[PDB]
Symmetry: C3
Subunit: 391 residues, 3 copies
Amino acid sequence: MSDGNVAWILASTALVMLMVPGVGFFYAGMVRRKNAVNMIALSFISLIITVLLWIFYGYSVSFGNDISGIIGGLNYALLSGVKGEDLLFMMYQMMFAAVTIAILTSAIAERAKVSSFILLSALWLTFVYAPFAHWLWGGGWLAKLGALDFAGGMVVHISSGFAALAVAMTIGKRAGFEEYSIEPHSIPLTLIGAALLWFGWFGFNGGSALAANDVAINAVVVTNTSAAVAGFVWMVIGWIKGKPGSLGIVSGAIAGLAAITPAAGFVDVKGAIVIGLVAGIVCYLAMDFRIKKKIDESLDAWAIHGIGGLWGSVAVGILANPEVNGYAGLLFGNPQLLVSQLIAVASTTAYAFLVTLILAKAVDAAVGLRVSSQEEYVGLDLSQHEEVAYT
Amino acid sequence: MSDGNVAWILASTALVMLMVPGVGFFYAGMVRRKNAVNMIALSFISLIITVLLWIFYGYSVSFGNDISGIIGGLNYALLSGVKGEDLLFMMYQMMFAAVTIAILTSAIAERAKVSSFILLSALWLTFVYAPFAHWLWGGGWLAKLGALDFAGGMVVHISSGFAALAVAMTIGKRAGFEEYSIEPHSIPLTLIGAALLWFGWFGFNGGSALAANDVAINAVVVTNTSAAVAGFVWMVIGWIKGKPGSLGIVSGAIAGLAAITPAAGFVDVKGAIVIGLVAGIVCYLAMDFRIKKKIDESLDAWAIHGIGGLWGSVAVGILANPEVNGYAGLLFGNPQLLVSQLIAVASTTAYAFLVTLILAKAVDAAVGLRVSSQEEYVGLDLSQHEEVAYT
Amino acid sequence: MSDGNVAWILASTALVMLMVPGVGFFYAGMVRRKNAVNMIALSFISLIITVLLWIFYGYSVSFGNDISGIIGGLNYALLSGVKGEDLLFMMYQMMFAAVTIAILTSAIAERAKVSSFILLSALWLTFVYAPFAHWLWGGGWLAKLGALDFAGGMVVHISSGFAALAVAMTIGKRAGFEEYSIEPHSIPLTLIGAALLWFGWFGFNGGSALAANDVAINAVVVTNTSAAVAGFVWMVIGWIKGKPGSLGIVSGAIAGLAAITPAAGFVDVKGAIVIGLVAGIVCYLAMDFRIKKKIDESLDAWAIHGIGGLWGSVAVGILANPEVNGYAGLLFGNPQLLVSQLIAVASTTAYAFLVTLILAKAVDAAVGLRVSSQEEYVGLDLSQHEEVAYT
Ligand SMILES: [Xe]
Ligand SMILES: [Xe]
Ligand SMILES: [Xe]
Ligand SMILES: [Xe]
Ligand SMILES: [Xe]
Ligand SMILES: [Xe]
Ligand SMILES: [Xe]
Ligand SMILES: [Xe]
Ligand SMILES: [Xe]
Ligand SMILES: [Xe]
Ligand SMILES: [Xe]
Ligand SMILES: [Xe]
Ligand SMILES: [Xe]
Ligand SMILES: [Xe]
Ligand SMILES: [Xe]
Ligand SMILES: [Xe]
Ligand SMILES: [Xe]
Ligand SMILES: [Xe]
Ligand SMILES: [Xe]
Ligand SMILES: [Xe]
Ligand SMILES: [Xe]
Ligand SMILES: [Xe]
Ligand SMILES: [Xe]
Ligand SMILES: [Xe]
Ligand SMILES: [Xe]
Ligand SMILES: [Xe]
Ligand SMILES: [Xe]
Ligand SMILES: [Xe]
Ligand SMILES: [Xe]
Ligand SMILES: [Xe]
Ligand SMILES: [Xe]
Ligand SMILES: [Xe]
Ligand SMILES: [Xe]
Ligand SMILES: [Xe]
Ligand SMILES: [Xe]
Ligand SMILES: [Xe]
Ligand SMILES: [Xe]
C-alpha cells in the first residue's frame, strides 16, 4: 500500500504513457511531411494494440507462473486473478511494453503497412518482449543468474534497438535512402517529442523503484545526470564536426537516458557521469557505423537505444554501488555482477536480433512488410491513412 | 489528509488542467489555418473565465448548501469558508468545469464571437453545469435517487455533448459546410492535443477516487482499457470503410474514454471491454447520423462526448460490480441502479439540450452568436484576435 | 520522509523540468521561422548546462555552508555529502535554475552565439543565481533580514527579468527591430509552450511547500487565481485597445503567475486577486514602456517576469496573511515584512541588472555576444545549428 507510493506510481504510470505518443512526435518530425501522420499514428496504434494484448495475455506471459525459467503462464490471462497492487503493477508495466513497440517504429519509417506492423508488433510482443520481461523481472532464468536491469536497459532499450536493426535490414532501405539524404519536415515537432520523453522518463526510471523512496530519488538524479552529460557530448562532437544541431543534442541526451535506465537505481552520481560520457561516445560511433554500412535503421533506435541500452546494462556490473542500493560491481570488489550482466546482455542482444529477424521474414513472407513503391512515393499518410498532415 | 492522497490529487488537478488547452489543440488541428489561434484561444479563455466564476460563486452554487435538491447556496461565494481539503476539492472540480466548457467549443468552431462565447459560456456554467454538478455530486436530488457518475459521464460528457448539439443548431452551419468538406490544417497538432487528453485522463478518472487507493487504480486500468477497445473499433471501422485515419483512431479512443468516465470506479476489466466496444460502435453511428442530418455540430462533441457519456452512464447501471466498488448493476442482481441511471441520464440529457437551446437563442437575440460572413471568410484569427497563426 | 511528500515533490520536480523546454516553445513561436530551432535549442542547452553546473558546484554554492551571508561553500561540490532528502531538494532546485536561464533567452532572441550564451549563462548562474538562491533560500543575509520568497519571485523572476533587460541592452537591437515589427512564425507553437508553463507551475509554486500539505494546496489555488485574473486583465486591455490576441492573453496569465510565485504560499484568495489584477496592469504598462523606449528586450522577460516578480515580491509584504501561513504583511498589522521585502527587492533588482550588465560586456569584450549580420540574416537555425526548422 502506502498512499504516497501509490500516488507516485499512479503518476509514473501516466508519465510513461505519455512517452508513447512522445515517441511518435519525436520520430514524426524527422520524417517527410507526407509521412508525418503515419509516424505519429504508429505510436498511437502501438499503445492501443499493447493495452489489449497486455491485458488479454501479455501481462500473464510476462509475470505469470514461470516455466523453465523462460516464460510465464496464463494464470493472469484477461487479468484473471490480478488485484490491488498487482493491478497497478500490471498497468505501469503495460506502459513499458507500449513505449518499446513505439521506439521500434524507427526501423520502418516511411515504408511499412500498418497491418503488417500490427501483426509483426503483436508477435514481437509475444515472443521477444514478454520473454525478456519475464527473464529479468518475472523471476526468469536471467534473474536467477543474478542479472539486474533497473528500468529496462535490456528489456526495453536493447530489445527495441536490435529488433529495430533486424527489421530495418529485413524491410530494406527507403527509396533514395542512398542517392539523397531525407530531410526532417519539422524539427520543432521532434523537439516537442523530445521534451515529452525527458519529462516522462521521470516516471520511467524514477517509477521503477516502485515507491516514492530514496532509490527513486537517486534514479531521478542519475537519470538527469547521464542525460545532461551525453547531451553535452553530442553537443561537443557536433561543434567539433561543424555545428551543434539540436537533433544531435537531444539524440545525445536520449542515449544518456537509455544507458542510465538499467542502472538508474544502483549507481552514484559519479558513475552516472561516466555512464553518460561513454554512452554519448559509443552511440555516436554506432550511429556513424550504421550509417557507414548504409543500413536504413532510420531513426537510430539501434545506435541509440540498442547500443545505449547495451553499454548501460554492462556498466551496471561495473559501477553498481552497494552504498547506493546494496549491489556492487567490479569497481566495488564484485566481479560476479559484471558476469551476470555480460551473460544477460549477450543473451538478450542475440535473441532480440535473431528472433526478430525470423519474425520479420516470416511476416514478410506471409503478408509482406513494405508498401508498394508508389505508395512510398505519395507518402503513407495518404496511402495508409487516406489523410494529409498539413494544409 | 494523507500525504499520498493529497500528492495524488495535487497531481490529478494539474493533469485535468492540462486537458483544457489539450482540447484547444485537439480541436485546432481540425479547423482551417485561418481559425487555428481562435480554436486554441477559446480553450484558454474557457480556463480563465471558469477559474474566476468558480471561485466567485461557481464552486458554491455547485457544492454549497442544497436547496430543493437542485442547486447549492452561496455559503462558499469567493470561497468564503472553504479550507484545507475543501480547497483542494474545490480546485480539482474547478478543472472539470473548465474542460467541459472547452469540449463545448466544438459546436462553435470557426464562426462565433469570443464575447458571445464568454457570455453564453458563463451562463451555461451557471444554469447547466453548476446544477448538474450539484444534482450528482453536491448531494442533489439525482444523488438522492441513488444515481452515480464516477468521473463525469453526465456532469461533463453528456452536458457538453448535448449542449454542443443545441448550440450547433442555434448558431447555424459554417459557410460552405454543405458544398465542401472542411479540411484539417494540422493533424499533427490535433494528435498532440489527443496525446495530452489521454495523459490527463489519468488524473480525470483516476483522480476521481479522491485518494491514491484501489478505486483509483481500478479507474486507471479500466480507463485505459475502454480507450484502447474503442480506438481499436474505429480502427477496424475505418479499415472496413477504406483506410484507418489517425483522426478516426483517436476519436475512437476518446469515445471510449468518455463512456468509461462515469463508470471508471465501479466496473471490472471485462465490463470496461464491453463499455468500450459498444461506445466505439454507437458514437461512430452517432457521428454518421449527425453528419447524415447535415448538422454542423462541428467536432463531434455531441456524437462522441454526448453519446459516449450517455451510454457509459447507463452502462454503469448494468455492469457496476460490487466486487469492484461495492455497487452492483442489473447484471449483478440489481435492477434499481439501472433505473437510477436511466432517470439520471434522461433528466441530464433533456435539460442540457433544452436549457442550452434557450440560452443560445437568448444570447443570440440579446447580442448575436455568429460573426459576420466576411469575418468568417477571412478567419477568426484575424477578425476576432487580429492575429495570424503561421507565417 | 513521508511517502506522499516525496511522491508530490518527485512529481513537482518532473513538472518544473518540463517548464524549461516549455519556455523554448513559448519563445520559439514568437520568433521567425529561421530561428525557431535556435530558440528551442537554447532552452534545451540551458537545461543541460544547468544540470552539469548544479551538480558540479552550483548546488553547493547555493545551499552549502554560508560565508558572510552572501554565498555558500563547496562542501557539496559534485554533491559530495548530499543524500536522501537533500538529493531530492537538490534536484527540485536544479530545475528552478534551468527555467531561470531559459526565461533569460528572451533578451538574445534571434542574434546570439550559442557558445557565448553558454559562457554568459554559466557565469550568470555562478555570480547571480547561486548568490540569490543562497541569500533567500540558503540562509543568506536576505533571509536573515526576514525576507521571504515562496516560489521565486526574486530568485527566478526578478533575476531573469532584469538580467534580460541588461543583456538586451548590451547585445543591441535586432536588425530592423525599428523599421519593421517581427512577426511570430507559429502562434500555436507558442500556445503549446504556454500550456506547458501553466501546467508545470503546479509543481513550481505548489511544490515549493516541499510537502503535499495545506500550504501547497493554497499555493495551487492562489496560483491559478492570480493567473486567471491577470489573463483576464490583458484580455480586457486587448479588447479595449482593439482585439484580444491570444498572445496578450497568455502573456497576461504568465504575468499573474510570476507575481504570485513569491507569495503563492502566504496570501489568501482575495490577496491573489489583487496581486493578479495589479500584475496585469503594471506588466502591461512595463511592456509598453520598454517598447516606447525602443529596447529590444525581445520577448518581455523583463516587462513580465522582471516586473511581475518585483510587484509580487513586494505584494508579499503587504498581503501576507497569518491566517494562511503564519506570516503577516502591512495590511495585517505588520510593517516589518514590507520593509524586508522592499530591501530584498531593492538589492536583488539592482544586483541582477548591474552585475548582469558587467558580465555581458565582459563576455562581449572577451568573445563577442552577437552573430554576424549575415548570420542574423540567414537565421541562426542555419548559421548556428546548420539546421532548418521546417521543410
Ligand atoms: Xe525515441
Ligand atoms: Xe503490440
Ligand atoms: Xe503480449
Ligand atoms: Xe506497484
Ligand atoms: Xe512492418
Ligand atoms: Xe515492428
Ligand atoms: Xe531528450
Ligand atoms: Xe528537453
Ligand atoms: Xe505534457
Ligand atoms: Xe523512449
Ligand atoms: Xe529524468
Ligand atoms: Xe550495424
Ligand atoms: Xe475533445
Ligand atoms: Xe466559463
Ligand atoms: Xe458558475
Ligand atoms: Xe480532495
Ligand atoms: Xe457563441
Ligand atoms: Xe458555448
Ligand atoms: Xe486520445
Ligand atoms: Xe495517445
Ligand atoms: Xe476531454
Ligand atoms: Xe487514462
Ligand atoms: Xe443529431
Ligand atoms: Xe504524485
Ligand atoms: Xe504529473
Ligand atoms: Xe516564459
Ligand atoms: Xe547554465
Ligand atoms: Xe552554478
Ligand atoms: Xe525535499
Ligand atoms: Xe549571449
Ligand atoms: Xe544569457
Ligand atoms: Xe506538447
Ligand atoms: Xe500561460
Ligand atoms: Xe493554458
Ligand atoms: Xe516560466
Ligand atoms: Xe498552477
Ligand atoms: Xe525599460
